[PDB]
Structure 1
Amino acid sequence: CSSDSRYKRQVSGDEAYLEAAPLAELHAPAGMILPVTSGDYAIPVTNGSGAVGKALDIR
């Protein structure tokens, strides 16, 4: 049978997602203040110590 099954340890093949896309920010002018990130969009930024890529062991 040609139907098979094998895959080992890594984060997913988007290793672009180890790089955390350069977000071109938006500061509102005065008197023209707009709302902010809401919904899912909340990033507690902690690239403080932690593994990306293959180094992120999953088991």
Structure 2
Amino acid sequence: RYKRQVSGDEAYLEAAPLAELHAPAGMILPVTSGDYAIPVTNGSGAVGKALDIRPP
């Protein structure tokens, strides 16, 4: 409840980037699944408070 009033406010975050895991020789990493996979959407828009979330 009270915690949501902080999120509904404006608080932002910058967390662990995504680094692909290497595969040793004589084996392989498991399969992609692809469910949670984020495409590389190009360009820069404002983010975290810089972005105007007012309704157009």
* Alignment TM-score, normalising by the size of structure 1: 0.46
- Root-mean-square deviation (Å): 5.1
TM-score by length of structure 2 reads 0.47
**Alpha-carbon spacing, 1:8–1:41, altered in 2? closer, same or farther (3 Å):** closer
Deviations 1:2-57 (A, max 9, x none): xxxx9999994798964241345421112211224424321113362112111222
Structure 1 or 2, whichever has the larger Rg, is 1
Within a 5 Å distance, the mapping from 1:1-59 to structure 2 comes to 12=7, 18-46=13-41, 48-59=43-54
Runs (5+) with no aligned partner, structure 2: none
Gaps of 5+ in 1: 1-5
More helix by share: 1
* Structure 2 contact 10–49 (Cα < 8 Å) conserved: no
Structure possessing the higher relative contact order (Cα contacts under 8 Å, 6 or more residues apart)? 1
Give identity over the alignment, percent: 100
